[PDB]
Design a protein around this ligand. Structure first.
Ligand SMILES: O=C[C@H](O)[C@H](O)[C@H](O)COP(=O)(O)O
Ligand SMILES: O=C[C@H](O)[C@H](O)[C@H](O)COP(=O)(O)O
Ligand SMILES: O=C[C@H](O)[C@H](O)[C@H](O)COP(=O)(O)O
Ligand SMILES: O=C[C@H](O)[C@H](O)[C@H](O)COP(=O)(O)O
Lengths: 152, 151, 151, 152
């Protein structure tokens, strides 16, 4: 009954990949990091790593994903291209919490060049720990997102 | 003419006139097309994200501006439309880089999270900042297209 | 009873009732003491920073909340009062750390920069989060006091 | 006719002290970084380094100061304790620009643990490049801060 969390980065965020692994563990003993990012700081293409994590989330191999690039923007765009994925670019505690409470987000995206590591830590912990509210209006809106996916 | 479709849900309705103004402030060539709600009544963000995103995807407008409480819902829903690159921005840097690196065509903002003067800065910066056209960025954007195609 | 003096200038007057509410939301023991403008007309932030800062310095209230356009003016002016440790916060993390590390007694926020729900989070976090009391932080806080004394 | 910019940090921000020096230079050839922070990653007390930079600014030895700690908060508080200093904790381009335009700030404070380095870069460049507006209401308000100092 533990919860798997796939982690991916591109090259700038490779610098903090050990941080990301640690922060997932810090969210609780029930969270198991699955690192899927690169092994060097050599230039790579973020969509490749977004895709790897997003597909795992979509196939339900893991419950959550954590993605980091320079700004988080690339990861959030690429990951959301996978049906079943709800990837939330978060920059603080509030966005991290609300992404779960309102959007039942399954992937958190952060920017290594934009957000300091202790805020990234807080984002990851908050994202993982905060439950989805389950409230009627949110469920309806999430279903509407799914409908958009279905239509394409 | 560079058309900019604008969508909100209910919390961001109170600033929909702001959004129209900020788009215009980016330059005379930027033409706001308001596609959001007509009243303050509660609505569902994906409906308005979808409207704007489809317009961008269809090439009916060049850009979209989406606002909800946090910006998160707008960014998720809009990105579900093939051809859309929706960037949730919270400052000048993210606004600029979404264009320079990601060639983003939709900017998403949170009315409950980001103060209006920063939202103003975000919108203006997003609209005014060109895509770099750099080899690596073009390659990565095409990879995003490939993800869409694979699904 | 833990009293919290509140001050704003004109851009933040629009949310002064929010600020009062957010203080109360932190807990029944938190009592807001509104010391800001009674109207929306232009005022000078240092006048209201001074009023609240002096109350904190005097030990008349435990805490202060100051809001201006960016929070910057409030943070500069309030810190000019000996005994005041005014922290410009823009998120939950800065709100918490201002208390844990700096034992801050005034929180400053920007109405034009930070969305109201984040301002809410900042105020609640600031008031609820205790000072760590750690040796190194105490020492550093004392060095701030010494800077005041040397002037 | 060049413009001297004193730079101080405590220990968490020492890792980016070379960054800070570079970012000041990037603001323009007219800006001269004057590094005054620690020489090592050894734990230090931020008020000591805030004071050194703030005193340089107050005595007019330099025009501007750049201060970095974990959150920027400690630097902001300590530097503002020196009369003649207007130290602005900035977290983005907007606060960086407005601290100059409105507050004629002479010290910019940033958090190494909160703000990513490319945003710190933008903050420093924006802070240094953006002039004070000189507008009547701002001058009056700045004078009122000076009055507060004088009264103590
Ligand atoms: O959104 C994309 C992310 O920010 C990437 O990390 C960034 O574009 C890479 O930039 P560069 O290192 O290739 O210049
Ligand atoms: O991402 C979604 C955006 O934050 C919505 O505006 C929010 O969920 C609306 O919340 P509520 O007004 O229905 O509570
Ligand atoms: O730091 C000062 C705060 O941001 C003030 O609210 C701001 O300067 C007021 O600007 P204006 O309304 O007088 O233009
Ligand atoms: O405001 C003060 C700044 O955030 C300091 O860098 C921080 O308190 C240092 O904390 P520690 O490394 O001593 O735990």
């Amino acid at each position: 009954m533990t919860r798997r969390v796939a982690i991916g980065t591109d090259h700038p965020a490779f610098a903090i990949h050990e941080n990301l692994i640690l922060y997932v563990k810090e969210a609780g003993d029930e969270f198991v990091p699955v690192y899927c990012g690169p092994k060097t700081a050599e230039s790579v293409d973020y969509p490749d790593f977004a895709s790897r994590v997003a597909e795992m989330v979509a196939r339900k191999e893991v419950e959550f994903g954590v993605l980091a690039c320079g700004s988080g923007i690339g990861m959030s765009i690429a990951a959301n291209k996978v049906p079943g994925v709800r990837a939330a670019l978060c920059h603080d505690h509030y966005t991290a919490a609300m992404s779960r409470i309102h959007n039942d987000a399954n992937i958190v995206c952060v920017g290594e060049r934009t957000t300091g590591v202790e805020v990234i830590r807080e984002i990851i912990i908050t994202f993982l720990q905060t439950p989805f509210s389950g409230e009627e209006r949110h469920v309806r809106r999430i279903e509407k997102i799914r409908a958009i996916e279905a239509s394409h």
